[PDB]
UniProtKB/Swiss-Prot annotation, chain B:
Residues of the full protein shown: 372 to 504 of 902
Protein name, entry field: Gamma-tubulin complex component 2
Sequence similarity: Belongs to the TUBGCP family.
Disease implicated: Cortical dysplasia, complex, with other brain malformations 15: An autosomal recessive disorder characterized by global developmental delay, variably impaired intellectual development, speech delay, facial dysmorphism, microcephaly, and varying degrees of cortical malformations including pachygyria, thin corpus callosum and subcortical band heterotopia. Most patients have generalized seizures.
Subunit structure, interactors included: Component of the gamma-tubulin ring complex (gTuRC) consisting of TUBGCP2, TUBGCP3, TUBGCP4, TUBGCP5 and TUBGCP6 and gamma-tubulin TUBG1 or TUBG2. TUBGCP2, TUBGCP3, TUBGCP4, TUBGCP5 and TUBGCP6 assemble in a 5:5:2:1:1 stoichiometry; each is associated with a gamma-tubulin, thereby arranging 14 gamma-tubulins in a helical manner. Gamma-tubulin at the first position is blocked by TUBGCP3 at the last position, allowing 13 protafilaments to grow into a microtubule.
Source superkingdom: Eukaryota
Function: Component of the gamma-tubulin ring complex (gTuRC) which mediates microtubule nucleation. The gTuRC regulates the minus-end nucleation of alpha-beta tubulin heterodimers that grow into microtubule protafilaments, a critical step in centrosome duplication and spindle formation. Plays a role in neuronal migration.
Lineage: Eukaryota, Metazoa, Chordata, Craniata, Vertebrata
Tissue specificity note: Ubiquitously expressed.
Native source organism of the sequence: Homo sapiens
Compartment(s) of residence: Cytoplasm, Cytoskeleton, Microtubule organizing center, Centrosome
Residues making up the signal peptide according to the UniProt record: none
Coiled coil: none
Length: 66, 93, 45
């Protein structure tokens, strides 16, 4: 009477993540930004920062806005 | 003695659940008292005070049961606060 | 019977704890530990 209920909870726990909270989206989204998979973004972020090069380029007014 | 102490609190709470202290420009009208908080509604100590407060700025112009490990009353409060604003916000637009 | 009637009521509160998340073979020991935390996690969501 126990194992019959364990599989139903876990299957309902994992399913709750995908179809409601979009766990499959977060992974395929962080890759777009962190691992620089989406072009026109790294080619636009790195291209901006590299245009400058100390006290500049370090305050939250430029790098928090770029 | 757990069926008993549930029969008392079920009857010693009907007056409270039929009415936070009031006073006599609008942030001093009703104010939370910090001591007398059930410490299991401490999560929603601000939505309760905000729920009735909206009901009074319109009135003067013109069931809950306790369960353990089940939040049927925590959800029941949000279902009324989500209406308490939709009658006042619409009343000003 | 006498021992059974004790065990039948000496486990009454322990079932309630088990009735929240919803030696002996370790194949199910570690599983109970996670079969409850999931329920205690869905209660806050």
């Amino acid at each position: 009477p126990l194992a019959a209920h364990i599989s139903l909870v876990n299957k309902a726990a994992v399913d709750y993540f995908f179809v409601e909270l979009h766990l499959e989206a977060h992974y395929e989204a962080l890759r777009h930004f962190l691992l620089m998979e989406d072009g026109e973004f790294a080619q636009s972020l790195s291209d901006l920062l590299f245009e400058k090069l100390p006290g500049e380029l370090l305050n939250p007014l430029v790098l928090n806005s770029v | 003695a757990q069926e008993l102490c549930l029969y008392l609190t079920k009857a010693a709470s009907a007056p409270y659940f039929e009415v936070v202290e009031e006073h006599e420009y609008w942030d001093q009208r009703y104010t939370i008292v910090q001591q007398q908080i059930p410490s299991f509604l401490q999560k929603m100590a601000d939505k309760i005070l905000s729920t009735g407060k909206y009901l009074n700025v319109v009135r003067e112009c013109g069931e809950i049961i306790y369960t353990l490990k089940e939040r049927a009353y925590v959800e029941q409060i949000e279902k009324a606060f989500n209406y308490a604003s939709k009658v006042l916000l619409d009343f000003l637009m | 019977p006498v021992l059974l009637s004790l065990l039948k009521t000496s486990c009454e509160p322990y079932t309630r704890f088990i009735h929240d998340w919803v030696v002996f073979l370790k194949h199910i020991a570690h599983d109970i530990y996670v079969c409850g935390k999931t329920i205690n996690l869905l209660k806050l969501c």
